[PDB]
């Protein structure tokens, strides 16, 4: 009453337990070891050990990533504990949108653009991407951009395109002072007579973090821009009517 099928199914369940162990440890290559809420190493790390390091050799001379490896936020974090015990929220000490915390958070990614397989910038304003054009749908260029306060924050002056994925990724929006900001495509609604942005009221557009070069955007800048805009869903909700 212990034949090959019995041996096979018991063996498979042992294999499956080992596979889950492997998979869980592989998924601990970021964020671990766990920390106390004051940032020191936590006593309880759970039953799965930290994976042993692996290395990625990044293309384009960008260096080498080793994970797991010593982790640091690499940025100040303007939040304060609300309770002595564990498990309660940490409250922004300043302006959470400006300080990049909560749903406004950004990560200290590389302050360089993402590159394509040929080492060129992946994202470019359409005005610098030879032959790129709107090929279907409403072209937003020239439209007014409206915030959740129903007021106009600016007008669209270019589309920033992912070249290898041929995808609109940002709208470049000119503000009343003549500077521009990038707005993530996933956070806008293109209509026939306007682009509407639920996440921001008109008065928060100038606070969108700026890019240092007019024809490229770094991964660090994208994180600051996208975090800020998404953070508006929480932090501009007093102005959403």
């Amino acid at each position: 009453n212990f034949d090959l099928a019995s041996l096979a199914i018991y063996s498979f369940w042992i294999f499956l337990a080992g596979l889950i162990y492997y998979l869980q440890t592989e998924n601990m290559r970021e964020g671990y070891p766990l920390e106390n809420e004051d940032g020191t190493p936590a006593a309880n790390q759970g039953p799965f050990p930290l994976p042993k390091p692996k290395t990625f050799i990044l293309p384009h001379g960008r260096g080498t990533l080793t994970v797991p490896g010593p982790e640091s936020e690499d940025r100040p974090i303007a939040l304060a504990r609300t309770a002595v015990s564990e498990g309660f929220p940490h409250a922004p000490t300043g302006d959470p949108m400006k300080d990049g915390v909560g749903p406004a958070s950004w990560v200290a990614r590389r302050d360089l653009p993402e590159l394509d397989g040929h080492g060129h910038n992946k994202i470019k304003p359409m005005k610098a991407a030879a032959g790129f054009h709107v090929s279907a749908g409403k072209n937003p260029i020239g439209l007014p951009v409206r915030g959740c306060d129903l007021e106009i924050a600016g007008k669209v002056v270019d589309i920033w395109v992912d070249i290898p994925e041929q995808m609109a990724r940002f709208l470049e929006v000119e503000l009343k002072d003549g500077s521009t900001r990038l707005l993530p495509m996933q956070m806008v609604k293109v209509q026939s007579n306007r682009v509407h942005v639920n996440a921001l009221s008109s008065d928060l557009f100038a606070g969108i973090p700026t890019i240092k070069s007019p024809t490229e955007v770094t991964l660090l800048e994208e994180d600051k821009i996208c975090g800020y805009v998404a953070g508006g869903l929480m932090y501009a909700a007093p102005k959403r009517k």
């Binding site: 990044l58 498990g87 929220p89 915390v101 958070s105 994925e165 869903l233």
Partner: protein, 281 residues
């Protein structure tokens, strides 16, 4: 304890009900009003399953089975030991599952992310409700629902299917299966593709998404792209579950015969039903 990058996200806000009253975590788990609700529904449901097991006389999880009321109860309430426990457990399960989805919504709002995950989960909840609520109500009896037991619910699948002959012939079931198989195909391919680029051949730098595109174009002549493949995985899995619900909500409500007969249409069309030869001639 926190992930090394987590503290900056653990801010107040985003709750739908209760303000800051439930706005806290237990270890990794967010609580929220719907975490409390989930706990209440799940604990009560589990308690009632334990009660049913006591009535049944077994602690064996492979034998515990909570049956719905006999068909003769129609849509009425039944005594606890005779289907009433199944009825209350089903209310608790529904409450636990919906509370779980709304807890996910609060989590989405605190994190400033889209609502796609609890929306996707709602398809699973609707498929469950198709089998224990919508179909039993349309059919006129709770006793058409499946029982809660590890093996007895499979027997319910088998008995229900074979009521209609080979259930393979249900055309919405065919569509559902095609989505489940295609979904598993797409998941294997997507996982392999990303891993084959992040973990290239030995002696090589990490590949780029352009290598992923080139690989799939070389292989089959088309690359759906990184945004497209996540849209597609969501679509295939949700469509599988949609057509699952569809293939059952019609069975026993507007279709009563052997499912193979549905196809007898195309065979018996008048301009070729009588042509000698073939299979159907």
């Amino acid at each position: 304890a926190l992930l090394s990058f987590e503290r900056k996200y653990r801010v107040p806000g985003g709750t739908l009900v209760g303000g800051n009253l439930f706005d806290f975590w237990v270890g990794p788990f967010y609580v929220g009003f719907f975490g409390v609700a989930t706990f209440f529904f799940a604990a009560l449901g589990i308690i009632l399953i334990a009660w049913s097991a006591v009535l049944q006389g077994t602690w064996n999880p492979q034998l515990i089975s909570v049956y719905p009321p006999a068909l003769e109860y129609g849509l009425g309430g039944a005594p606890l030991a005779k289907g009433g426990l199944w009825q209350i457990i089903t209310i608790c399960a529904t409450g636990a599952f919906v509370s779980w989805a709304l807890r996910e919504v609060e989590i989405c709002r605190k994190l400033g992310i889209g609502y796609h995950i609890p929306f996707a989960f709602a398809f699973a909840i609707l498929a469950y409700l198709t089998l224990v609520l919508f179909r039993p109500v349309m059919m006129g009896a709770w006793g058409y629902a499946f029982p809660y037991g590890i093996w007895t619910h499979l027997d319910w699948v088998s008995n229900t299917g074979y009521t209609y002959g080979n259930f393979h012939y249900n055309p919405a079931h065919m569509i559902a299966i095609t989505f489940f198989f295609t979904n598993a195909l797409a998941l294997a391919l997507h996982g392999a593709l990303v891993l084959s680029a992040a973990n290239p051949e030995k002696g090589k730098e990490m590949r780029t998404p352009d290598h992923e595109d080139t690989f799939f174009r070389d292989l089959v002549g088309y690359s759906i792209g990184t945004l497209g493949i996540h849209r597609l995985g969501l679509l295939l899995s949700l469509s599988a579950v949609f057509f699952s619900a569809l293939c059952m909500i019609i069975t026993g409500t507007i279709w009563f015969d052997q499912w193979v007969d549905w196809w007898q249409w195309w065979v018996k069309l008048p301009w070729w039903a009588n042509i000698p030869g073939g299979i159907n001639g």
